[PDB]
């Protein structure tokens, strides 16, 4: 029985390029987390309490997603490498602009997973593609959700009354098409 | 065992300037109470039932805060001096104007507590600073709440539909960012 | 009514040096969070499942403490500034060494709060000292807890059997003197 | 409607090399089952009751996994071919040695699934890759579990006291990092 790079018994070696890609993806999700925190703060500063609560929950969820990846590296007997985290964007001219950045961030998170997925396919790492499959499924749902929230905010067309209605929807947990 | 100015056994004498400041602060909170009553009446006159219910509750709460201070003077064996109460402001041109006065009143209530706090610090009255600490904490929460209500009303920008939505939030007890 | 730097109604202006200190302290707690995450990973890599679970919970708690501070700045109508986050330490020669770093991190977190506290005292910001008081209380409890865990691990003197016993204590939630 | 090799209606023909690989994999899991039975006996002979209970359960689980594969061949209208089963290994010099064989067996079971998976990919048999995906996921979890048990036993470094503690963990069902 061989020992893996993190010292645990090694079921199968992992290509170092794939390992680097997973460590980088963990940073992408940690950065999404602090971005959603920044977005929750921006909404709280404008009394958009429902949007604040929504993004506060998204920040915690994104952090949990990042930790899920750290656990996979542990399970594969690979080293983790927690990286420097850039400061998030913190200023937006409107809720519609913020929601566009949020949608883009979710899509970019999926693109990162897709990049890791293609690398695992090139390396015939079926543990990793299997591990990623449900995370891609979750990303489909999150993209659908964030397209819904962005589209609904854009429909409001900057009207405060409509944005207050949507804010209350979010406070109630009405955050998807259902 | 010495007797305090109100006749009870005296644990520690209080500086007369600090006593005067506490008696004056009791008047500040009694005045906030009747101001919130006046604000509840103004809202009821315009069918803003949720704002009316909110300010009716705030008036009762502010009175309770004033009585809490009268109990502290009793506990310190100091005399109370319930003072003449000015008539409140009763006319506003808009809900946004009323909410600005409400926020100012809360901030001014905190400033009064801060004034008493600094006097107790100068007199090394640690009973009084300890007594005031949780009241300052409550003031932080109330300032955050009234900034939320004022900011949300200003976001409405005088639109009746948005103000009706916010009114219903208040009727439901949705009065903070949460 | 004046508007604060984050745009909300302003109850009382805050000294920019104190604001900078609070923003820096938020970074200190975010850094403690990712450090505890790194520590949980190190323990998981060595099958110390109870220590892994403990530090995983501490990472989430420290993040919550950081967000509590962001909410205070919102309440004071001050801007948040979420900063770049350094990479955590990730390598230790022993559990005793890791636990010493953990204790040091908790003590350093308290020192940061103490620094902010003294600045607020110099600026007579009683809202901020009142806000910090319960956080200092929590820090006392955490220092007592981490001295307990470090002391118990040092008592084990590197014996695997004793460290396995302590690991199981932590898995069961037995993490304090009680 | 065509009839498959086992006589049932045939949804889609299967490549004979892939069929042979699945039949061989069923033997691999049946062999893992009797190996875990042998391991449970070895532990019972040394009064390691928790390890005995653990491996007794693993033997039954591995058999269930093998039968799950026989059901898939039935569903694909393919013939099963239950093969001669070699005698398991039955002697180990230590618990650490046994646990290393156990980890190796789990990793080798995954390698067999990976071999079948690559053959299905080469034959564009998407039913089979979909069928195998959750089994690979389970293998990730089992490899993580057996690395945990092996690593914890190695940490004990042959000390009876530590091995008795771990034995009791296993009796209680504490068999993973959690
Ligand atoms: Cl907008
Ligand atoms: Cl208005
Ligand atoms: Cl140690
Ligand atoms: Cl051994
Ligand atoms: Na990387
Ligand atoms: Na795939
Ligand atoms: Na007076
Ligand atoms: Na004090
Ligand atoms: Na700073
Ligand atoms: Na103080
Ligand atoms: Na075969
Ligand atoms: Na596939």
Numbering used by the authors:
A (entry chain A), B (entry chain A), C (entry chain A), D (entry chain A): 5 to 182
What does the paper say about this structure?
High-resolution structures of SynFtn revealed that the side chain of residue Asp65 lies in close proximity to Glu62, raising the possibility that the two residues form a transient binding site for iron. Variant D65A was therefore constructed to determine the importance of this residue in SynFtn function. Variant D65A also crystallized under identical conditions to those reported for wild-type SynFtn, and the resulting D65A structure overlays with that for the wild-type protein (overall rmsd of 0.09 Å). Protein structures derived from all crystals harvested without iron enrichment were free of bound metal ions, as expected. In the metal-free structure of variant D65A the side chain of Glu141 is oriented towards the threefold channel, and, in contrast to wild-type protein, the exposure of crystals to Fe2+ for either 2 or 20 min did not lead to a change in conformation of Glu141, regardless of the fractional occupancy of site 3. However, the rate at which Fe2+ binds to FOC sites in variant D65A was only 50 % that of the wild-type protein under the same conditions, suggesting a role for Asp65 in uptake of Fe2+. In contrast, the initial rate of mineral core formation in variant D65A is 0.35 µm s−1, only ~35 % of the 0.95 µm s−1 rate of wild-type SynFtn, consistent with the hypothesis that Asp65 plays a role in transporting ferric-oxo species away from the FOC. Therefore, the impaired mineralization activity of variant D65A cannot be a consequence of increased stability of the di-Fe3+ form of the FOC, as was reported for variant E62A, suggesting that the replacement of Asp65 has a less direct effect on the exit of Fe3+ from the FOC. In the absence of Asp65, the pathway for Fe2+ into the FOC may be altered, apparently resulting in inhibition of Fe3+ egress, and suggesting that the pathways for iron entry and exit from the FOC are closely associated, such that disruption of the uptake route can cause a clash with the exit route.
